[PDB]
Protein backbone atom coordinates (compact mmCIF):
# COMPACT_ATOMS: atom_id res chain seq x y z
CA UNK A 1 0.00 0.00 0.00
CA UNK A 2 3.14 2.18 0.09
CA UNK A 3 4.37 0.68 -3.19
CA UNK A 4 7.60 2.03 -4.66
CA UNK A 5 8.06 2.94 -8.32
CA UNK A 6 11.49 2.60 -9.92
CA UNK A 7 11.86 3.92 -13.48
CA UNK A 8 15.38 3.60 -14.84
CA UNK A 9 18.46 2.96 -12.74
CA UNK A 10 18.34 6.36 -11.06
CA UNK A 11 14.83 7.10 -9.76
CA UNK A 12 12.76 6.09 -6.74
CA UNK A 13 9.39 7.63 -5.87
CA UNK A 14 7.23 6.40 -2.99
CA UNK A 15 3.46 6.57 -3.38
CA UNK A 16 0.30 4.93 -2.06
CA UNK A 17 -2.46 3.36 -4.19
CA UNK A 18 -4.75 6.07 -5.58
CA UNK A 19 -6.59 7.15 -8.74
CA UNK A 20 -5.07 8.06 -12.12
CA UNK A 21 -6.46 9.99 -15.08
CA UNK A 22 -5.54 8.54 -18.45
CA UNK A 23 -5.52 11.31 -21.05
CA UNK A 24 -8.50 11.58 -23.32
CA UNK A 25 -8.93 7.84 -22.83
CA UNK A 26 -5.79 6.57 -24.59
CA UNK A 27 -2.45 5.44 -23.24
CA UNK A 28 0.74 6.83 -24.84
CA UNK A 29 2.12 4.50 -27.49
CA UNK A 30 4.70 4.25 -30.24
CA UNK A 31 4.06 5.40 -33.79
CA UNK A 32 2.83 2.69 -36.16
CA UNK A 33 3.35 2.48 -39.93
CA UNK A 34 0.21 4.23 -41.23
CA UNK A 35 0.62 7.32 -39.02
CA UNK A 36 3.81 9.16 -40.10
CA UNK A 37 4.96 11.25 -43.05
CA UNK A 38 8.74 11.45 -42.43
CA UNK A 39 11.22 9.67 -44.69
CA UNK A 40 13.13 7.77 -41.98
CA UNK A 41 12.84 5.54 -38.90
CA UNK A 42 12.24 6.94 -35.38
CA UNK A 43 15.01 5.21 -33.33
CA UNK A 44 13.36 5.82 -29.97
CA UNK A 45 15.73 6.31 -26.97
CA UNK A 46 13.80 4.03 -24.62
CA UNK A 47 16.99 2.88 -22.86
CA UNK A 48 17.83 6.27 -21.35
CA UNK A 49 14.96 8.79 -21.18
CA UNK A 50 12.22 7.03 -19.18
CA UNK A 51 12.76 8.24 -15.61
CA UNK A 52 11.27 10.64 -13.07
CA UNK A 53 12.19 14.33 -13.34
CA UNK A 54 11.12 15.78 -9.99
CA UNK A 55 11.02 19.56 -10.37
CA UNK A 56 11.51 22.05 -7.55
CA UNK A 57 8.76 22.40 -4.98
CA UNK A 58 6.48 25.41 -4.92
CA UNK A 59 5.05 26.79 -1.68
CA UNK A 60 1.25 26.95 -1.57
CA UNK A 61 0.81 29.93 0.71
CA UNK A 62 -2.42 31.49 1.93
CA UNK A 63 -2.45 34.23 -0.71
CA UNK A 64 -1.25 32.31 -3.78
CA UNK A 65 -3.29 32.23 -6.97
CA UNK A 66 -1.97 29.53 -9.29
CA UNK A 67 0.98 28.26 -11.30
CA UNK A 68 1.54 27.01 -14.84
CA UNK A 69 4.32 25.20 -16.68
CA UNK A 70 4.48 24.97 -20.47
CA UNK A 71 5.54 21.63 -21.93
CA UNK A 72 7.92 20.34 -23.31
CA UNK A 73 9.95 23.41 -22.32
CA UNK A 74 9.54 22.38 -18.65
CA UNK A 75 12.21 19.68 -19.20
CA UNK A 76 14.62 21.82 -21.22
CA UNK A 77 17.54 21.43 -18.78
CA UNK A 78 16.36 18.18 -17.13
CA UNK A 79 19.07 15.74 -18.06
CA UNK A 80 19.19 13.63 -21.20
CA UNK A 81 15.65 14.57 -22.29
CA UNK A 82 16.91 18.13 -22.59
CA UNK A 83 19.81 16.86 -24.70
CA UNK A 84 17.41 15.11 -27.07
CA UNK A 85 15.55 18.39 -27.49
CA UNK A 86 18.87 19.85 -28.64
CA UNK A 87 20.33 17.12 -30.85
CA UNK A 88 17.21 16.29 -32.88
CA UNK A 89 14.72 18.00 -35.18
CA UNK A 90 11.36 16.32 -34.53
CA UNK A 91 9.99 14.78 -31.36
CA UNK A 92 6.93 13.04 -30.00
CA UNK A 93 6.30 12.14 -26.37
CA UNK A 94 3.60 11.46 -23.82
CA UNK A 95 4.02 12.34 -20.14
CA UNK A 96 2.86 11.08 -16.71
CA UNK A 97 2.64 14.23 -14.54
CA UNK A 98 2.38 13.20 -10.89
CA UNK A 99 1.45 16.00 -8.48
CA UNK A 100 1.37 15.53 -4.72
CA UNK A 101 1.23 17.71 -1.61
CA UNK A 102 2.49 17.29 1.96
CA UNK A 103 -0.16 18.75 4.26
CA UNK A 104 -1.24 17.84 7.76
CA UNK A 105 -4.76 16.96 8.86
CA UNK A 106 -5.12 20.47 10.31
CA UNK A 107 -4.69 22.15 6.90
CA UNK A 108 -7.49 22.70 4.41
CA UNK A 109 -7.67 23.63 0.75
CA UNK A 110 -8.41 22.43 -2.74
CA UNK A 111 -6.40 22.40 -5.97
CA UNK A 112 -7.37 21.82 -9.59
CA UNK A 113 -4.62 20.24 -11.68
CA UNK A 114 -5.35 20.66 -15.40
CA UNK A 115 -3.46 19.63 -18.54
CA UNK A 116 -4.55 22.07 -21.25
CA UNK A 117 -3.66 21.05 -24.84
CA UNK A 118 -2.72 24.10 -26.96
CA UNK A 119 -3.16 26.64 -24.17
CA UNK A 120 -2.47 29.70 -26.28
CA UNK A 121 -2.38 32.77 -24.07
CA UNK A 122 -3.38 36.37 -24.61
CA UNK A 123 -1.34 39.43 -23.77
CA UNK A 124 -1.80 41.87 -20.92
CA UNK A 125 -1.95 44.76 -23.40
CA UNK A 126 -4.42 44.60 -26.26
CA UNK A 127 -3.10 45.55 -29.72
CA UNK A 128 0.22 43.97 -28.68
CA UNK A 129 1.87 40.56 -28.57
CA UNK A 130 3.58 38.36 -26.00
CA UNK A 131 7.25 37.46 -25.88
CA UNK A 132 8.62 33.99 -25.23
CA UNK A 133 10.21 35.12 -21.96
CA UNK A 134 6.78 35.81 -20.43
CA UNK A 135 5.05 32.59 -21.51
CA UNK A 136 7.21 30.23 -19.47
CA UNK A 137 10.45 29.86 -17.59
CA UNK A 138 12.56 26.82 -18.35
CA UNK A 139 12.01 24.93 -15.07
CA UNK A 140 10.20 27.20 -12.59
CA UNK A 141 6.51 27.98 -12.44
CA UNK A 142 4.76 31.09 -13.69
CA UNK A 143 2.35 32.65 -11.21
CA UNK A 144 -1.21 33.70 -11.85
CA UNK A 145 -2.35 36.91 -10.17
CA UNK A 146 -5.41 38.00 -8.22
CA UNK A 147 -5.47 41.49 -9.71
CA UNK A 148 -4.97 42.68 -13.30
CA UNK A 149 -1.55 42.54 -14.91
CA UNK A 150 -0.65 45.67 -16.82
CA UNK A 151 2.64 45.16 -18.67
CA UNK A 152 3.46 45.79 -22.31
CA UNK A 153 4.57 42.35 -23.56
CA UNK A 154 3.46 40.19 -20.62
CA UNK A 155 0.59 37.72 -20.24
CA UNK A 156 -2.82 38.57 -18.83
CA UNK A 157 -2.15 36.63 -15.63
CA UNK A 158 -5.48 37.24 -13.91
CA UNK A 159 -6.58 34.06 -12.26
CA UNK A 160 -10.30 33.73 -13.00
CA UNK A 161 -9.78 33.96 -16.77
CA UNK A 162 -6.91 31.40 -16.76
CA UNK A 163 -4.82 33.39 -19.26
CA UNK A 164 -7.00 32.17 -22.15
CA UNK A 165 -10.09 34.37 -21.79
CA UNK A 166 -12.43 31.65 -20.49
CA UNK A 167 -14.12 30.77 -17.22
CA UNK A 168 -11.72 29.16 -14.77
CA UNK A 169 -14.40 26.74 -13.59
CA UNK A 170 -14.74 25.36 -17.13
CA UNK A 171 -11.10 24.13 -17.30
CA UNK A 172 -12.58 20.85 -15.99
CA UNK A 173 -13.24 20.06 -19.71
CA UNK A 174 -9.53 19.04 -20.19
CA UNK A 175 -7.87 16.06 -18.33
CA UNK A 176 -7.94 17.08 -14.64
CA UNK A 177 -7.79 15.99 -11.01
CA UNK A 178 -8.84 17.58 -7.73
CA UNK A 179 -6.45 17.60 -4.79
CA UNK A 180 -8.78 18.13 -1.83
CA UNK A 181 -6.61 18.11 1.30
CA UNK A 182 -9.45 16.67 3.41
CA UNK A 183 -9.49 13.40 1.45
CA UNK A 184 -7.04 13.45 -1.48
CA UNK A 185 -3.31 13.99 -1.31
CA UNK A 186 -1.95 13.31 -4.78
CA UNK A 187 -2.88 13.61 -8.44
CA UNK A 188 -1.50 11.77 -11.47
CA UNK A 189 -2.42 12.53 -15.08
CA UNK A 190 -1.17 10.51 -18.06
CA UNK A 191 -1.10 12.80 -21.11
CA UNK A 192 -0.68 11.37 -24.62
CA UNK A 193 0.82 13.22 -27.57
CA UNK A 194 -1.80 15.53 -29.09
CA UNK A 195 -0.98 17.43 -32.28
CA UNK A 196 -2.26 17.87 -35.81
CA UNK A 197 1.02 16.51 -37.22
CA UNK A 198 2.65 13.22 -36.18
CA UNK A 199 5.88 14.92 -35.05
CA UNK A 200 6.73 18.53 -34.30
CA UNK A 201 9.85 20.49 -33.44
CA UNK A 202 9.90 20.82 -29.65
CA UNK A 203 11.44 24.28 -29.37
CA UNK A 204 8.80 26.47 -31.01
CA UNK A 205 5.67 24.48 -30.16
CA UNK A 206 4.19 24.16 -26.68
CA UNK A 207 2.28 20.89 -26.61
CA UNK A 208 0.29 21.48 -23.42
CA UNK A 209 0.22 23.50 -20.21
CA UNK A 210 -0.02 22.09 -16.69
CA UNK A 211 -2.02 24.49 -14.52
CA UNK A 212 -2.43 24.13 -10.75
CA UNK A 213 -5.07 26.53 -9.40
CA UNK A 214 -6.34 26.67 -5.79
CA UNK A 215 -10.12 27.01 -5.76
CA UNK A 216 -10.53 26.86 -1.97
CA UNK A 217 -7.69 28.82 -0.41
CA UNK A 218 -5.32 27.42 2.18
CA UNK A 219 -6.26 27.98 5.81
CA UNK A 220 -4.41 27.00 8.97
CA UNK A 221 -4.17 28.05 12.59
CA UNK A 222 -1.17 29.62 14.29
CA UNK A 223 0.69 26.42 15.23
CA UNK A 224 0.90 25.26 11.65
CA UNK A 225 3.60 25.58 9.04
CA UNK A 226 2.33 28.37 6.84
CA UNK A 227 2.65 26.65 3.45
CA UNK A 228 2.05 23.30 1.79
CA UNK A 229 4.77 22.09 -0.61
CA UNK A 230 3.43 20.95 -3.99
CA UNK A 231 5.88 18.60 -5.72
CA UNK A 232 5.49 17.89 -9.44
CA UNK A 233 7.16 14.85 -11.03
CA UNK A 234 7.18 14.39 -14.81
CA UNK A 235 8.05 11.08 -16.48
CA UNK A 236 8.17 11.01 -20.31
CA UNK A 237 6.50 8.14 -22.13
CA UNK A 238 7.31 6.51 -25.49
CA UNK A 239 9.60 9.32 -26.64
CA UNK A 240 10.79 9.04 -30.24
CA UNK A 241 12.61 11.45 -32.52
CA UNK A 242 14.03 12.10 -36.02
CA UNK A 243 16.68 14.29 -37.59
CA UNK A 244 20.03 13.71 -35.87
CA UNK A 245 22.23 16.83 -36.11
CA UNK A 246 24.09 19.30 -33.89
CA UNK A 247 22.59 21.39 -31.09
CA UNK A 248 21.09 24.76 -32.03
CA UNK A 249 21.56 26.35 -29.65
CA UNK A 250 24.14 25.28 -28.62
Amino acid sequence: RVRSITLGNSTITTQECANVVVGYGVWPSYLQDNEATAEDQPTQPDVATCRFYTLDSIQWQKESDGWWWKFPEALKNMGLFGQNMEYHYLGRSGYTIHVQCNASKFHQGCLLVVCVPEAEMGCSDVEREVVAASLSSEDTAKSFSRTESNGQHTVQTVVYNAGMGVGVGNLTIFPHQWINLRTNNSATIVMPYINSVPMDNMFRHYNFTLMIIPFAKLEYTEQASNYVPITVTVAPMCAEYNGLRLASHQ
Binding site: Q156, Y160, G167, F203, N207
Partner: protein, 231 residues
Protein backbone atom coordinates in the same frame (compact mmCIF):
# COMPACT_ATOMS: atom_id res chain seq x y z
CA UNK B 1 -36.39 8.89 -24.43
CA UNK B 2 -35.59 11.67 -26.91
CA UNK B 3 -33.17 11.99 -29.83
CA UNK B 4 -29.72 13.58 -29.75
CA UNK B 5 -29.20 14.15 -33.48
CA UNK B 6 -29.78 17.90 -33.16
CA UNK B 7 -26.56 18.33 -31.16
CA UNK B 8 -24.18 16.21 -33.20
CA UNK B 9 -21.05 17.89 -34.54
CA UNK B 10 -22.35 17.79 -38.11
CA UNK B 11 -25.69 19.37 -37.16
CA UNK B 12 -23.99 22.00 -34.93
CA UNK B 13 -21.14 23.12 -37.21
CA UNK B 14 -22.65 22.66 -40.76
CA UNK B 15 -25.11 25.62 -41.15
CA UNK B 16 -24.57 28.13 -44.03
CA UNK B 17 -23.63 31.58 -42.71
CA UNK B 18 -23.11 34.90 -44.44
CA UNK B 19 -19.45 35.58 -43.64
CA UNK B 20 -18.54 38.31 -46.12
CA UNK B 21 -20.48 41.05 -47.91
CA UNK B 22 -18.50 43.18 -50.35
CA UNK B 23 -19.28 45.28 -53.40
CA UNK B 24 -17.46 45.71 -56.71
CA UNK B 25 -18.11 48.09 -59.60
CA UNK B 26 -17.72 47.53 -63.34
CA UNK B 27 -16.11 50.72 -64.71
CA UNK B 28 -12.82 52.47 -64.18
CA UNK B 29 -11.37 54.83 -61.62
CA UNK B 30 -9.21 53.43 -58.87
CA UNK B 31 -8.12 49.81 -59.58
CA UNK B 32 -9.43 48.48 -56.28
CA UNK B 33 -13.24 48.66 -56.30
CA UNK B 34 -13.48 46.80 -59.62
CA UNK B 35 -13.17 43.41 -57.88
CA UNK B 36 -13.74 41.73 -54.53
CA UNK B 37 -11.45 39.61 -52.37
CA UNK B 38 -11.83 37.36 -49.33
CA UNK B 39 -9.12 35.35 -47.63
CA UNK B 40 -10.94 32.29 -46.31
CA UNK B 41 -10.65 32.48 -42.53
CA UNK B 42 -13.11 31.58 -39.79
CA UNK B 43 -12.05 34.37 -37.43
CA UNK B 44 -13.52 37.61 -38.78
CA UNK B 45 -17.10 36.57 -37.91
CA UNK B 46 -17.44 36.26 -34.09
CA UNK B 47 -20.69 34.20 -34.14
CA UNK B 48 -19.06 31.34 -36.14
CA UNK B 49 -15.69 31.85 -34.47
CA UNK B 50 -17.13 30.95 -31.06
CA UNK B 51 -18.69 27.73 -32.38
CA UNK B 52 -15.42 26.66 -34.03
CA UNK B 53 -13.47 27.57 -30.89
CA UNK B 54 -15.25 24.95 -28.84
CA UNK B 55 -12.72 22.57 -30.42
CA UNK B 56 -8.96 22.51 -30.84
CA UNK B 57 -8.61 20.49 -34.04
CA UNK B 58 -11.09 20.52 -36.92
CA UNK B 59 -11.27 18.79 -40.30
CA UNK B 60 -13.87 19.63 -42.93
CA UNK B 61 -14.61 20.33 -46.57
CA UNK B 62 -15.97 23.71 -47.61
CA UNK B 63 -19.25 24.48 -49.36
CA UNK B 64 -19.19 28.09 -50.51
CA UNK B 65 -22.17 29.75 -52.19
CA UNK B 66 -22.21 33.19 -53.81
CA UNK B 67 -25.30 35.41 -53.94
CA UNK B 68 -24.55 38.15 -56.48
CA UNK B 69 -27.13 40.90 -57.04
CA UNK B 70 -26.23 43.81 -59.30
CA UNK B 71 -27.74 47.23 -59.86
CA UNK B 72 -27.50 50.15 -62.27
CA UNK B 73 -25.55 53.15 -61.04
CA UNK B 74 -27.11 56.63 -61.30
CA UNK B 75 -25.69 59.62 -63.11
CA UNK B 76 -25.32 60.41 -66.78
CA UNK B 77 -24.30 58.02 -69.59
CA UNK B 78 -26.68 55.14 -68.68
CA UNK B 79 -26.64 51.87 -70.69
CA UNK B 80 -30.36 51.67 -71.61
CA UNK B 81 -30.42 48.08 -72.96
CA UNK B 82 -27.39 46.20 -71.48
CA UNK B 83 -27.05 42.48 -72.50
CA UNK B 84 -26.40 40.34 -69.35
CA UNK B 85 -23.70 40.38 -66.63
CA UNK B 86 -21.29 37.41 -66.40
CA UNK B 87 -19.05 37.14 -63.29
CA UNK B 88 -15.82 35.19 -62.71
CA UNK B 89 -15.28 33.82 -59.19
CA UNK B 90 -11.73 32.50 -58.81
CA UNK B 91 -10.52 30.26 -55.98
CA UNK B 92 -6.75 30.81 -55.58
CA UNK B 93 -5.54 27.51 -54.05
CA UNK B 94 -3.14 28.20 -51.11
CA UNK B 95 0.17 29.40 -52.61
CA UNK B 96 -1.41 30.33 -55.99
CA UNK B 97 -1.18 33.42 -58.26
CA UNK B 98 -3.21 36.27 -56.66
CA UNK B 99 -4.64 39.17 -58.76
CA UNK B 100 -3.10 42.62 -58.05
CA UNK B 101 -6.05 44.22 -59.86
CA UNK B 102 -8.72 43.38 -62.50
CA UNK B 103 -7.63 42.27 -66.05
CA UNK B 104 -4.47 40.64 -64.55
CA UNK B 105 -3.01 37.38 -65.96
CA UNK B 106 -3.84 35.78 -62.57
CA UNK B 107 -7.50 35.73 -63.72
CA UNK B 108 -6.55 33.68 -66.86
CA UNK B 109 -4.26 31.31 -64.88
CA UNK B 110 -5.30 27.65 -65.44
CA UNK B 111 -4.11 26.71 -61.92
CA UNK B 112 -6.73 28.79 -60.03
CA UNK B 113 -10.15 27.09 -60.37
CA UNK B 114 -12.83 29.58 -61.62
CA UNK B 115 -16.65 29.71 -62.12
CA UNK B 116 -18.27 31.73 -64.97
CA UNK B 117 -21.83 32.56 -63.89
CA UNK B 118 -24.57 34.42 -65.76
CA UNK B 119 -27.14 36.51 -63.92
CA UNK B 120 -30.75 35.41 -63.64
CA UNK B 121 -30.37 31.78 -62.55
CA UNK B 122 -29.41 29.70 -59.51
CA UNK B 123 -26.39 30.94 -57.52
CA UNK B 124 -22.86 29.69 -58.02
CA UNK B 125 -21.58 26.88 -55.81
CA UNK B 126 -18.19 25.24 -55.30
CA UNK B 127 -16.78 22.65 -52.93
CA UNK B 128 -13.19 22.64 -51.65
CA UNK B 129 -11.70 19.56 -49.94
CA UNK B 130 -9.48 19.47 -46.86
CA UNK B 131 -6.41 21.31 -48.14
CA UNK B 132 -3.57 21.08 -45.64
CA UNK B 133 -0.15 19.54 -45.27
CA UNK B 134 -1.20 18.70 -41.72
CA UNK B 135 -3.87 16.23 -40.71
CA UNK B 136 -6.31 18.83 -39.31
CA UNK B 137 -6.83 22.53 -39.00
CA UNK B 138 -6.04 24.03 -35.61
CA UNK B 139 -8.13 26.75 -34.01
CA UNK B 140 -5.35 27.32 -31.48
CA UNK B 141 -1.58 27.17 -31.81
CA UNK B 142 0.54 27.51 -28.67
CA UNK B 143 3.72 28.13 -30.58
CA UNK B 144 5.58 30.14 -33.17
CA UNK B 145 5.95 30.19 -36.94
CA UNK B 146 9.72 30.15 -37.45
CA UNK B 147 12.44 28.14 -35.72
CA UNK B 148 14.11 29.94 -32.81
CA UNK B 149 10.91 31.24 -31.10
CA UNK B 150 10.84 34.23 -33.47
CA UNK B 151 7.84 35.34 -35.47
CA UNK B 152 4.17 35.96 -34.84
CA UNK B 153 2.48 33.91 -32.09
CA UNK B 154 0.47 31.51 -34.29
CA UNK B 155 -0.46 33.23 -37.58
CA UNK B 156 1.75 31.72 -40.31
CA UNK B 157 0.45 28.18 -39.41
CA UNK B 158 -0.64 25.64 -42.11
CA UNK B 159 -4.29 26.69 -41.60
CA UNK B 160 -4.45 28.45 -45.01
CA UNK B 161 -7.63 27.79 -47.06
CA UNK B 162 -6.93 30.23 -49.89
CA UNK B 163 -8.63 33.29 -51.32
CA UNK B 164 -11.74 34.05 -53.37
CA UNK B 165 -11.68 36.80 -56.01
CA UNK B 166 -14.73 37.98 -57.98
CA UNK B 167 -14.94 40.35 -60.97
CA UNK B 168 -17.14 41.22 -63.93
CA UNK B 169 -16.22 39.46 -67.16
CA UNK B 170 -17.95 42.08 -69.33
CA UNK B 171 -16.16 44.98 -71.02
CA UNK B 172 -18.91 47.50 -70.25
CA UNK B 173 -18.05 50.98 -71.53
CA UNK B 174 -21.19 53.08 -71.09
CA UNK B 175 -22.82 52.86 -67.68
CA UNK B 176 -21.54 51.32 -64.45
CA UNK B 177 -23.00 48.20 -62.82
CA UNK B 178 -22.38 47.76 -59.09
CA UNK B 179 -22.68 44.18 -57.85
CA UNK B 180 -22.83 42.97 -54.26
CA UNK B 181 -21.44 39.57 -53.30
CA UNK B 182 -22.69 37.48 -50.37
CA UNK B 183 -20.59 34.50 -49.32
CA UNK B 184 -22.45 31.69 -47.54
CA UNK B 185 -19.73 29.45 -46.14
CA UNK B 186 -20.59 25.99 -44.84
CA UNK B 187 -18.44 23.10 -43.53
CA UNK B 188 -19.18 19.53 -44.58
CA UNK B 189 -18.08 16.23 -42.98
CA UNK B 190 -16.78 18.07 -39.86
CA UNK B 191 -14.60 16.00 -37.47
CA UNK B 192 -13.62 17.79 -34.25
CA UNK B 193 -11.27 16.90 -31.38
CA UNK B 194 -10.24 18.19 -27.88
CA UNK B 195 -13.32 20.16 -26.70
CA UNK B 196 -12.40 23.60 -25.24
CA UNK B 197 -14.43 25.88 -22.86
CA UNK B 198 -16.70 28.49 -24.45
CA UNK B 199 -15.22 31.94 -24.42
CA UNK B 200 -16.18 34.49 -21.77
CA UNK B 201 -14.36 37.66 -22.81
CA UNK B 202 -15.26 39.43 -26.06
CA UNK B 203 -12.89 39.34 -29.01
CA UNK B 204 -10.61 42.21 -30.01
CA UNK B 205 -9.03 41.10 -33.31
CA UNK B 206 -8.97 38.14 -35.69
CA UNK B 207 -5.31 37.25 -35.29
CA UNK B 208 -5.04 36.71 -31.53
CA UNK B 209 -6.68 35.36 -28.42
CA UNK B 210 -6.20 38.73 -26.67
CA UNK B 211 -8.91 39.74 -24.17
CA UNK B 212 -9.94 42.12 -21.36
CA UNK B 213 -10.66 40.62 -17.82
CA UNK B 214 -14.41 40.03 -17.53
CA UNK B 215 -16.59 38.67 -14.75
CA UNK B 216 -17.35 34.96 -14.67
CA UNK B 217 -21.15 35.44 -14.53
CA UNK B 218 -23.87 38.01 -13.77
CA UNK B 219 -24.35 39.36 -10.24
CA UNK B 220 -27.09 38.56 -7.72
CA UNK B 221 -28.36 40.15 -4.50
CA UNK B 222 -27.33 37.51 -1.95
CA UNK B 223 -26.10 33.92 -1.81
CA UNK B 224 -29.55 32.85 -0.59
CA UNK B 225 -31.41 35.10 -3.09
CA UNK B 226 -33.90 33.08 -5.18
CA UNK B 227 -35.72 35.49 -7.50
CA UNK B 228 -39.22 37.09 -7.49
CA UNK B 229 -41.13 34.36 -5.56
CA UNK B 230 -44.33 35.30 -7.51
CA UNK B 231 -46.71 33.60 -4.94
Amino acid sequence: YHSRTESSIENFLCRAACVYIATYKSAGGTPTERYASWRINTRQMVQLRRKFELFTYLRFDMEITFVITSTQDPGTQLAQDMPVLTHQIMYIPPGGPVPNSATDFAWQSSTNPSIFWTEGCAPARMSVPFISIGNAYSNFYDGWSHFTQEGVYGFNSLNNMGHIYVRHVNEQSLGVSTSTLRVYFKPKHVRAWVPRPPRLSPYVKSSNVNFKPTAVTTERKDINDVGTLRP
